[PDB]
A = this chain, B = another copy of it.
Amino acid sequence: TDNTFVSGNCDVVIGIVNNTVYDPLQPELDSFKEELDKYFKNHTS
């Protein structure tokens, strides 16, 4: 995401291809979400 920027849509670009843009913030918050799930178990003890 930091290497590119979002503009327009996919229709206005001639020759555009489909791929999966890697979000650098997605796994960091997902791994932190798994850390929260470990801390959520401490709410019962």
Residues of A within 8 A of B (CB): 25, 28-29, 32-33, 36, 39-40, 42-45
Contact = CB atoms under 8 A, between A and B. Distances in A.
Task: Report the copy number of this chain in the oligomer.
Answer: 2
A45 B44 CA distance: 6
B32 A39 contact: no
Contacts of A25: 25, 28
Contacts of A39: 33, 36, 40, 43
A33 to B, nearest CB: 8
Q: Nearest 3 pairs between A and B by C-beta?
A: A43-B43, A40-B42, A29-B32
A32 B25 CA distance: 11
A38 to B, nearest CB: 11
